[PDB]
Every structure is written in structure tokens, then in C-alpha cells.
Enzyme design. Structure first.
Site, PDB file in Angstrom:
ATOM      1  N   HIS A  96       0.752  -1.257   0.000  1.00  0.00           N
ATOM      2  CA  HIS A  96       0.000   0.000   0.000  1.00  0.00           C
ATOM      3  C   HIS A  96       0.795   1.328   0.000  1.00  0.00           C
ATOM      4  CE1 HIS A  96      -4.493   1.031   0.618  1.00  0.00           C
ATOM      5  NE2 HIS A  96      -3.982   1.609  -0.477  1.00  0.00           N
ATOM      6  N   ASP A 119      -9.992  -0.348   3.541  1.00  0.00           N
ATOM      7  CA  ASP A 119      -8.898  -1.005   4.219  1.00  0.00           C
ATOM      8  C   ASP A 119      -9.338  -1.297   5.659  1.00  0.00           C
ATOM      9  OD1 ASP A 119      -6.211  -1.510   5.169  1.00  0.00           O
ATOM     10  OD2 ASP A 119      -5.473   0.144   3.907  1.00  0.00           O
ATOM     11  N   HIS A 121      -7.274  -0.906   7.899  1.00  0.00           N
ATOM     12  CA  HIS A 121      -6.373   0.052   8.524  1.00  0.00           C
ATOM     13  C   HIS A 121      -6.503   1.441   7.931  1.00  0.00           C
ATOM     14  CE1 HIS A 121      -4.421  -3.957   8.101  1.00  0.00           C
ATOM     15  NE2 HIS A 121      -4.411  -3.867   9.436  1.00  0.00           N
ATOM     16  N   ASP A 123      -3.752   3.442   7.814  1.00  0.00           N
ATOM     17  CA  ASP A 123      -2.488   3.670   7.130  1.00  0.00           C
ATOM     18  C   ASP A 123      -2.074   5.146   7.197  1.00  0.00           C
ATOM     19  OD1 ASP A 123      -2.699   1.050   6.542  1.00  0.00           O
ATOM     20  OD2 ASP A 123      -3.040   1.365   4.397  1.00  0.00           O
ATOM     21  N   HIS A 136       4.124   1.078   4.470  1.00  0.00           N
ATOM     22  CA  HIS A 136       2.802   0.697   3.962  1.00  0.00           C
ATOM     23  C   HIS A 136       1.704   1.168   4.927  1.00  0.00           C
ATOM     24  CE1 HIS A 136       1.891  -3.208   6.250  1.00  0.00           C
ATOM     25  NE2 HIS A 136       2.977  -2.692   6.844  1.00  0.00           N
ATOM     26  N   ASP A 227      -7.297  -1.750  -0.403  1.00  0.00           N
ATOM     27  CA  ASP A 227      -6.405  -2.706   0.250  1.00  0.00           C
ATOM     28  C   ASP A 227      -7.239  -3.974   0.452  1.00  0.00           C
ATOM     29  OD1 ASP A 227      -4.952  -4.386   1.997  1.00  0.00           O
ATOM     30  OD2 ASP A 227      -4.162  -2.691   3.134  1.00  0.00           O
ATOM     31  N   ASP A 229      -7.034  -6.393   2.302  1.00  0.00           N
ATOM     32  CA  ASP A 229      -7.269  -6.815   3.672  1.00  0.00           C
ATOM     33  C   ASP A 229      -8.500  -6.126   4.263  1.00  0.00           C
ATOM     34  OD1 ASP A 229      -6.498  -4.294   4.883  1.00  0.00           O
ATOM     35  OD2 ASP A 229      -4.435  -4.939   5.112  1.00  0.00           O
ATOM     36  N   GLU A 272      -1.896  -4.887  -1.829  1.00  0.00           N
ATOM     37  CA  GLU A 272      -1.608  -5.919  -0.816  1.00  0.00           C
ATOM     38  C   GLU A 272      -1.907  -7.400  -1.091  1.00  0.00           C
ATOM     39  OE1 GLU A 272       0.392  -4.952   1.496  1.00  0.00           O
ATOM     40  OE2 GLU A 272      -0.126  -2.944   2.217  1.00  0.00           O
TER      41      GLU A 272
HETATM   42 MN   LIG Z   1      -3.462  -0.393   3.356  1.00  0.00          MN
HETATM   43 MN   LIG Z   2      -4.654  -2.788   5.409  1.00  0.00          MN
END
Ligand SMILES: [Mn+2]
Ligand SMILES: [Mn+2]
Ligand SMILES: [Mn+2]
Ligand SMILES: [Mn+2]
Ligand SMILES: [Mn+2]
Ligand SMILES: [Mn+2]
Lengths: 314, 314, 314
Positions: A96, A119, A121, A123, A136, A227, A229, A272
């Protein structure tokens, strides 16, 4: 409209090798050919070759600053180039951290763009707040106007210019936010939909609200940085930082179908996907297939089906 | 606010040995340490040592009545003690029959409390309606005022005083109700949200309605009794009575996050975690981990993140 | 009311052998016995023996047209018979092509019936639009009045009479529709709820609308044709055409409970269960158990529990 695929096989933004194999796995899965079946014109720009900065000593805690900064400067150049010709940029990560170059380049051409970040997250760790020096987990920190000068200049990032404000980004899928990051988003008043707002409202209303928030006043280009995830590990297990309790395959497709409908998608990141983190070949296949499905969905593929216009099938 | 963990390593409420190891497994997973990182003051009271009643002959069908009744009397004494000093009690089971003591003790200090029961089961079988003499399936019968004198007095339970009425309890997650229990809940007019109401309404609206029902008139302490089988076996497989089609990890966290937000959580039970029922170590890990996550969520851990007050992370 | 189970162990409607074993698997799980415990009277008519048409040459692309046409003529006779006696027909597939005889037979007795089709596929390909000559993907083309004369007459289907119009069918669960089929449903104006509408609305509102759409004006007999692939492969993996991102176990049960509550269920098909396609015995068990659960649900089994009327359980 035209689509330009740009592979960013880069992994120095984090410690787990393998994400560089991401673009390959996605192409291997027929991503490019399947896109040609859509109403779009597709052109594959191939993969970018990233020059490795020798003697890249870490900056305080930040690892590989120069190598990441350079790879991103190069990506931003390529993206600004394709954007200028009026095409839609699709970047295949890679970790990322490449969103820095992707969004920077995109913003040079469309300064008024908004970002939808999917995401688990945020980030948004700054170089001072990271517990690991991994970049990332810091992309957004480098892009915000409101975070300018709140952290020391890092080696290799002097070309970066904070292009978007806190008002231009919306997070969807949050469920793993560090104390520092949480402090940042609250203090900056950044609009977000963590898994709890998704559970409370349902994905349909979540999309309604992000649209009325970002496009209410002016219709502007949309950059969707995705992302993998952000979806639950059951659907996208082959990622570096899986967190349980995420978006379902259905919700993910719902997000991309609504974005397609706005007619405003301008840039897209599929980040990712790490083929080497699948415990079984099927876990890898599961992850790649869903990444491909989300891309196709951004470009018109509907679950209710599609038929070519002017073709009387009877 | 202060929290006090009380372990109730008891299993006589049902035929599957193993739930007694529940508290140990939860502490082993770092439940206490992770709770100290929250804004709460935590005190671990240790596990209660229950005296086994020799010659505990069954009362008709009811198995181990005296052992269960006595373990519950002792638990009620402990909980009433902690509640008195103004601390929040957290009971780690152990099978669900320990709710008799946990809620009894809690009501001695907060007679106006209400109960939110999260379970795949109503656990309201009376000594007359049980198909098995298992007490983990009868807790609520002993606590309801409207059920007083509708069943013969059981050996070891004369100390119990029905503390809550049918108006003070709400069930969430129901999907395995015996004909008898069903008859009781319908007759007494007990508010419940079986999996079908969750499906129809969505967890967000389900919580809204339970709060308007239980706290609409008077704000009062809340006792949340959480049976881990309330969640789908995919998330909590290590229990004695798993039933498919349950609450998701997401809905479970949403329930606890909303309860935390009321500011009224006064007592909590994390019941039925049986470490010996996992088909694989990962299954036990999965179960323990989600139990811990639900507990932490009750005490403030949010999916959007948390940041300590007054700490300028920039 | 009376229920008559009719087994349709037929597989020539598609290339994968094994669906003929569908009825045996369902019976072996105790389907018929579990049904007798409900408030309905059950009569098991056994399995129809289908005569194989020797030298069944393909009609252009269409495979086994005569065998399929004959098996369906025979099934329609049986169903018309039971419906005439005022009993509810339950057909156990077998591939989805058997819906031709099942719905045809039902319509001879109840001409004003409506159809709720649960499936990942529209199954409306015409002999001219199929990419494969497989008839399991064409049932509805043969039943629609609006599609009469839009495709050449097929050997073995001359007895079929288009019984329902585009206004009488609702699809729920669509997520794999061919270009041709998509053109057809869009052109004919057929009501449908693909996975995206389900995501957007929630299964609750989806059911509210399919009922106001089909029954708003006139209350009429309901025929529920259920293709097991309509649910996600995680719940029903033992089918021939599994498509990720389907209805959950909970949504499927919600659909059957609502249908039960209308009091209008008149015909039911449980199609596409293929025992030989499970990768592990557990996968077959999972598929069978959910098919059984959905059947029992249509006939009254509720997640909130059931109790026999007039029995005072206290
Ligand atoms: Mn990310
Ligand atoms: Mn993530
Ligand atoms: Mn319980
Ligand atoms: Mn239970
Ligand atoms: Mn199908
Ligand atoms: Mn079908």
C-alpha cells in the site's frame, strides 16, 4: 473510455516479501483479458522496473525511505502521464505505500479528486507515530495537507506535495487502528465508516452517505485505493495484515458496483495481494479471484448480469 | 471505574466435563493483562473453589442439584460483595448455570437491574420441563418471579430469591428452543430477538429496540450474560451446545460496543467456553480469542480505534 | 393440510452425473420422518422411474431433449394428480430442468399461481441462446408465455403449454446471468432481486416487496422452486454450479419462514443437490442438512421454537 493497467511490483514498504508478485498473479488470472470483454478500451502498460537505492539506511525508525520514495516518484510520473491523456489508471500493487505515487500523480491532473480508502487500517501513521518503520502503514500521512510539517522530512520524499485535505478522504472497513492514528483521524475530523458503522447502517446506506459527503456539493473525480485486507480473511487470506471481522465478498462487490454507477471513477489501486502468504494454493486462488472480481466490478460487471447494447439476442 | 474478575470453574450444570477449564484458558490468553490497558482499574479475584457435595442424588430428573445450588450460593455471596463496593463484576464460566449466582448476587445490590441474555438457547427449562436434568439449561427458571411456585423446590436452591420479572429480560440470538420453553416465553410475554428478528431487522435496529424496551422508562444497571454459543460455531466452536446459523463475530462485537456505550454495564458473564471440545487447537484458539475480544469490547475497545485522552500524538 | 413427497432422480438436464442421487441423500437424512413431526400429514409417493429414450440425438445444441421432455411429461402428470386432490407437492431433484414438469403440473390445477425462483442463475436460456445445450439452464424459457414462438419447437416438449407470464415470477439470489438471459429478463420486465438488491435492501425488505408484488392484488397459490446453489457454496457445496457470494443459511431460512407464514405455499422444488460432488463427506452432510432445514422451514419449523397447541407444558 480508456483503461491503463500499471503494475507496481514493490514490497519495501513492509517486511513481508511476496507482494511484488501481486501484479503477476493478477495478470496470470486473466485480469487484462477479462477487462477487454467490458465496454472499456484496455491498454497494459506492463510492470515498472524499480531501481534499488543502495545503502538505504533507515531514517530514525522508518525503513527503506529512499527506495520507497524513489519507486513512488517514478509511479507518480507514470500516473500523471496516463491521467493527462484522459485515461483511467489502474495500479496493481505491491504494498500500500505505492498509493503515495498513485494518488500524487493522479492529483497533479485532477487536483479536486476525492479518495475512498477501503482497508482494515487507516495507514495514517506518521514517521513519528509508527511502532514499526514500515511505510505501507503511512501512505495517507504523506498525502494530507493537514499533516504537512507535523513530522520530519524523510529521505526520498521531498518531491511529494500534500495533495488532499482531511475533507477529501473517506475510510471504509476500519477495524485495526493504532492509538496514534485514531488520535489523528478524530483530531482532523476525517469521515470514516469502521466495521461498526457498516454493521449499524448496512453497506447500502454506508455508500449513500459517503457519496453525499464527498459529492454533495461538487461532482469530482474519484480515486479508489483498495487494500485487499479490507475484506475478511476468509475471502482474501493471502495478505500481509489480515484482521478478522471484515467486509464480506458481497459488501466488497457492492462497494465497487456503486462506484461504477457514479460514472466518476478516475483512479483505482488494487493493493496488498501477496501470493506467497496463502497457506494452500486454494487460499491464493481465492484471494486473486476476488481481487479480479472487484476490478471487473469497478468497470461495469454487474451481479444481475450484462448484455451488449444493440444486440437483439432473440 | 473498577472491574473485578471472578472465575467460576464449575461444570456440574451439564454432562460435558471441560467448561471448568474455561477461566484458565481465558486468563492464559491474556484477558486480564489486555483489560489493564483499558481505562479501567482491574482486580483479579482468582477462581472460586467449590466444595463438592457428596451423595448428590438427582432430584427427579435434575442432576447434581446440591452441588450446583451450593456453588451458586457461594458465587452469589462473592458477587454481592464486589457489587457492594461499587465495582463491575465479570464472571468467567463455567457452564451457564452459574448465572443463577452471578445475577442473584448482582440483584442484592442493584434490585432494579435488567438482563440481556445472549444465547442460542433460552435456558428457561423448569425442573418439570427438562428432557435432561441438566441445570445449565434452567438458570432463568430459577430467577424469574413469574415462575415462582410453578415447580417443586430443588435441593440446594432454597437460598435463591426470584429477583427479576419477565419485563426485565431480553434474549438475543435464539435459534434452539424446546417446545416447553417456547410455551413459557410466549405465555409470560418475554421480549426476544431470535435469529429471525436479527435477520429481519439487522443487529443495529435490534439493539435500538432492546434499549428502548429496557431503558425507555428508567435508566438502570445492566447485567449482560453472554453464552458463547450465541455466536455461530464458525467463530465459537469450542462449546458444549453449538447451533448453526448464529450471530457473527461482527454482530457479537456490535452488541458489546453498544452496551459499553450506554454507560450502564454493571455485571457480565462470559459463559460456556469449553477448551476440551475443540476438534483442533486452532478451534480452541478461535473460541478463546473471540471471548476475550467480546470482554474487551464491553469495556471500551472499539473497532474504529482508541487513543488515550490528553496525549498529543503529534 | 397434506404433503406428498415426489422424488425426481433425474440428471440428463446437465452434464454432471450424481444429481439423480439427490432424493436418496435427502431421504437417508430423515427428511420424510422429520416432516411427520410437523403439523402436516405426509405421504411419500416414492421416486418416479424415468424411461430412457434410446437414440436421443441432440436438437441443434440441445442435449437429451426427448429424455428430458418425457421425464417432465411424466412428472407433470403426477403433480397435476396430487394437486388435484388438494395436497401440497414437494419435488426432490434431480437437476432444475424438472421444474418444467413440476410447475406445468401445478399450473393445470392452479392456473393463477405465482413462482418464487431461488437460484444463482435465472435458468432462462432459450434453445437458441444457450452456450451449452444443457436443459437445466433453460426451464423458465419453456414456461413463459412471452417466450412462445421465440425459439424452435424441441423434440419431446410439444406437450408443454406456457403457463405463467413474466408478471408471475420473481427471482431471488441472482449472481451468474448470461448476456442472453440478462437481455431477456430486462426486455420482458421480470421482477428480480440479485445479490446486489439483497445487499442493498436486506433479506427482510426483499421479502416484503416480493409479496406486495406477487400478492398485492390477488392472493394466489405460491410455487417455490429452490435451487440449492442459490445459497453460498459454504452452506451448499455439493451442487453442480456453485457461485461465490450467495445467500446465507440465515437468509435462506428467512425466506422459507416468511413463505410459510403466508399460508399460501402450494408447490415446492428442492433441486440440484448432487451428493457425488462433495469433496469430503462433511460437504455432502452440510449440503443435505441445509436442504432438509429449508424444507422443514417451509412447513412450519421456526427458529424461535415451536410448541404443540393445546398442550400445557406446565
Ligand atoms: Mn493499506
Ligand atoms: Mn490494510
Ligand atoms: Mn446458556
Ligand atoms: Mn446456549
Ligand atoms: Mn442455479
Ligand atoms: Mn437452477
Amino acid at each position: 473510455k480508456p483503461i491503463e493497467i500499471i503494475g507496481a511490483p514493490f514490497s519495501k514498504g513492509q517486511p513481508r516479501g511476496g507482494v511484488e508478485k501481486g501484479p503477476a498473479a493478477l495478470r496470470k488470472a486473466g485480469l487484462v483479458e477479462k477487462l477487454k470483454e467490458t465496454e472499456y478500451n484496455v491498454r497494459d502498460h506492463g510492470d515498472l522496473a524499480f531501481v534499488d537505492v543502495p545503502n538505504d539506511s533507515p531514517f530514525q525508525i522508518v525503513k527503506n525511505p529512499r527506495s520507497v520514495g524513489k519507486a513512488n516518484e517514478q509511479l507518480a510520473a507514470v500516473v500523471a502521464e496516463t491521467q493527462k491523456n484522459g485515461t483511467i489508471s489502474v495500479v496493481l500493487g505491491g504494498d500500500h505505500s505505492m498509493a503515495i505515487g498513485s494518488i500524487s500523480g493522479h492529483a497533479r491532473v485532477h487536483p479536486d479528486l476525492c479518495v475512498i480508502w477501503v482497508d482494515a487500517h487507516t495507514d495514517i501513521n506518521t514517521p513519528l507515530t509508527t511502532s514499526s518503520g514500515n511505510l505501507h502503514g503511512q501512505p495517507v500521512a504523506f498525502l494530507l495537507k493537514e499533516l504537512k510539517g507535523k513530522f520530519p522530512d524523510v529521505p526520498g520524499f521531498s518531491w511529494v506535495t500534500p495533495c488532499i485535505s482531511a475533507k477529501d478522504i473517506v475510510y471504509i472497513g476500519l477495524r485495526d487502528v493504532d492509538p496514534g492514528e485514531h488520535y489523528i483521524i478524530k483530531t482532523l475530523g476525517i469521515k470514516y465508516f469502521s466495521m461498526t458503522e457498516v454493521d449499524k447502517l448496512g453497506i447500502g446506506k454506508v455508500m449513500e452517505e459517503t457519496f453525499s459527503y464527498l459529492l454533495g456539493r461538487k461532482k469530482r473525480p474519484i480515486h479508489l485505493s483498495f487494500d485487499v485486507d479490507g475484506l475478511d480473511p476468509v475471502f482474501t487470506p493471502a495478505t500481509g495484515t489480515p484482521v478478522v471481522g471484515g467486509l464480506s465478498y458481497r459488501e466488497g462487490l457492492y462497494i465497487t458496483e456503486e462506484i461504477y454507477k457514479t460514472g466518476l471513477l478516475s483512479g483505482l489501486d488494487i493493493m496488498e495481494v501477496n501470493p506467497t502468504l496463502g497457506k494452500t494454493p486454494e487460499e491464493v486462488t481465492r484471494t486473486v479471484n476476488t481481487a479480479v472480481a472487484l476490478t471487473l466490478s469497478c468497470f461495469g460487471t454487474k451481479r444481475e448480469g450484462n448484455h451488449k447494447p444493440e444486440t437483439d439476442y432473440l
